[PDB]
């Protein structure tokens, strides 16, 4: 991968442990490397099926993330499902 998928990139700035009032709240963090945020569909869809298109290294949530080209619902590619373990390219069903 060179970039993420343009539909799902979003750059929320860091916050080195400062609340809405710019004082120090959670100590010992800040100073790392500029991240982005990959908008994940964390609430499953209406009944459909999809094909795992890839698996991408993800900075925020340790696990890897898999854009799924969807065959139903007209989604035509959602950002992903938190990576299921076994299948690295297979077919899914969010609800029967």
């Amino acid at each position: 991968r060179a970039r993420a998928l343009r539909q799902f990139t979003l750059s929320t700035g860091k916050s080195a442990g400062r609340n809405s009032s710019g004082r120090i709240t959670v100590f010992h963090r800040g100073g790392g490397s500029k991240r982005l945020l990959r908008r994940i569909d964390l609430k499953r869809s209406t009944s459909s099926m999809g094909i795992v298109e890839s698996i991408e290294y993800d900075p925020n949530r340790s696990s890897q993330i898999a854009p799924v080209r969807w065959i139903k619902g007209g989604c035509q590619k959602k950002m992903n499902t938190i990576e299921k373990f076994a299948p690295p390219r297979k077919i899914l069903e969010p609800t029967t």
Binding site: R1, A2, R3, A4, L5, R6, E53, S54
Partner: peptide
Amino acid sequence: SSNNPNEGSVKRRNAKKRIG
């Protein structure tokens, strides 16, 4: 599986210009 369909869309104008 393309991640960037580009076009006759150009880049780095005010970087090139500065180099020149």
